Design a protein around this motif. Structure first.
Motif, PDB file in Angstrom:
ATOM      1  N   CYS A  37       0.844  -1.204   0.000  1.00  0.00           N
ATOM      2  CA  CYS A  37       0.000   0.000   0.000  1.00  0.00           C
ATOM      3  C   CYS A  37       0.882   1.258   0.000  1.00  0.00           C
ATOM      4  O   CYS A  37       1.711   1.437   0.903  1.00  0.00           O
ATOM      5  CB  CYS A  37      -0.915   0.015   1.208  1.00  0.00           C
ATOM      6  SG  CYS A  37      -2.010   1.410   1.208  1.00  0.00           S
ATOM      7  N   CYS A  40       0.150   3.486   3.503  1.00  0.00           N
ATOM      8  CA  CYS A  40       0.509   3.020   4.859  1.00  0.00           C
ATOM      9  C   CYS A  40       1.602   1.956   4.833  1.00  0.00           C
ATOM     10  O   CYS A  40       2.089   1.580   5.906  1.00  0.00           O
ATOM     11  CB  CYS A  40      -0.732   2.480   5.548  1.00  0.00           C
ATOM     12  SG  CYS A  40      -1.391   0.939   5.032  1.00  0.00           S
ATOM     13  N   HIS A  56      -8.046  -4.668   2.377  1.00  0.00           N
ATOM     14  CA  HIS A  56      -7.434  -3.453   2.985  1.00  0.00           C
ATOM     15  C   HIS A  56      -8.000  -2.195   2.320  1.00  0.00           C
ATOM     16  O   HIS A  56      -8.277  -1.200   3.019  1.00  0.00           O
ATOM     17  CB  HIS A  56      -5.912  -3.528   2.834  1.00  0.00           C
ATOM     18  CG  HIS A  56      -5.216  -2.294   3.324  1.00  0.00           C
ATOM     19  ND1 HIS A  56      -5.235  -1.919   4.655  1.00  0.00           N
ATOM     20  CD2 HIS A  56      -4.487  -1.340   2.704  1.00  0.00           C
ATOM     21  CE1 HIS A  56      -4.529  -0.793   4.785  1.00  0.00           C
ATOM     22  NE2 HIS A  56      -4.071  -0.392   3.612  1.00  0.00           N
ATOM     23  N   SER A  60      -9.848   0.700   4.556  1.00  0.00           N
ATOM     24  CA  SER A  60      -9.005   1.893   4.794  1.00  0.00           C
ATOM     25  C   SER A  60      -9.377   3.026   3.842  1.00  0.00           C
ATOM     26  O   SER A  60      -9.118   4.210   4.172  1.00  0.00           O
ATOM     27  CB  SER A  60      -7.540   1.561   4.666  1.00  0.00           C
ATOM     28  OG  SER A  60      -7.198   1.294   3.320  1.00  0.00           O
ATOM     29  N   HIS A  62      -7.553   3.322   1.133  1.00  0.00           N
ATOM     30  CA  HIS A  62      -6.258   3.669   0.518  1.00  0.00           C
ATOM     31  C   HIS A  62      -6.289   3.271  -0.948  1.00  0.00           C
ATOM     32  O   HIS A  62      -6.761   2.189  -1.321  1.00  0.00           O
ATOM     33  CB  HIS A  62      -5.106   3.022   1.258  1.00  0.00           C
ATOM     34  CG  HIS A  62      -4.915   3.540   2.633  1.00  0.00           C
ATOM     35  ND1 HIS A  62      -4.093   2.921   3.579  1.00  0.00           N
ATOM     36  CD2 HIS A  62      -5.461   4.603   3.258  1.00  0.00           C
ATOM     37  CE1 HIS A  62      -4.125   3.614   4.703  1.00  0.00           C
ATOM     38  NE2 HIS A  62      -4.972   4.626   4.538  1.00  0.00           N
TER      39      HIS A  62
HETATM   40 ZN   LIG Z   1      -2.894   1.268   3.330  1.00  0.00          ZN
END
Ligand SMILES: [Zn+2]
Ligand SMILES: O=C(O)CCc1nc2ccccc2c(=O)n1CC(=O)NCc1ccccc1
Ligand SMILES: [Zn+2]
Ligand SMILES: [Zn+2]
Length: 99
Positions: A37, A40, A56, A60, A62
């Motif tokens: 990612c 993060c 994820h 999140s 993201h």
């Molecule tokens: Zn992330």
């Protein structure tokens, strides 16, 4: 790939320790077909394994993930590959660690 996307603003500076392209999935521990990612720097497996990076993204939001197989960057929102100056440093570091 797209030369830009509106999610490149979420690409964060490279982690302290650098990148480890042999890092396993943080959920299932698979060595296969992991992504990192670019917000993060957690590592999770691809959709053809157990889908942990897609999980994820969902939990999140993201946007952008880099492949530890082929160093492509996918935007889950734009549903496309993206390549831009903002991704060169992370791709170069991953390439140095892999090869
Ligand atoms: Zn992330
Ligand atoms: O798997 C993830 O979680 C992140 C990559 C990704 N996710 C998707 C999620 C939903 C629908 C399509 C895709 C997609 O084509 N990609 C890109 C992709 O899978 N490309 C093929 C590929 C490229 C490099 C390494 C393995 C697979
Ligand atoms: Zn996994
Ligand atoms: Zn995008």
């Amino acid at each position: 790939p797209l030369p830009w996307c509106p999610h490149l603003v979420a690409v964060c500076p490279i982690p302290a320790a650098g990148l480890d392209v042999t890092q396993p999935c943080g959920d299932c521990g698979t060595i296969q077909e992991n992504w990192v990612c670019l917000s993060c720097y957690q590592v999770y497996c691809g959709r053809y394994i157990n889908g942990h990076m897609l999980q994820h993204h969902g939990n999140s939001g993201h946007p952008l993930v880099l492949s530890y197989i082929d160093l492509s960057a996918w935007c889950y929102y734009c549903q496309a590959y993206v390549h831009h100056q903002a991704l060169l440093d992370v791709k170069n570091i991953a390439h140095q660690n892999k090869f």
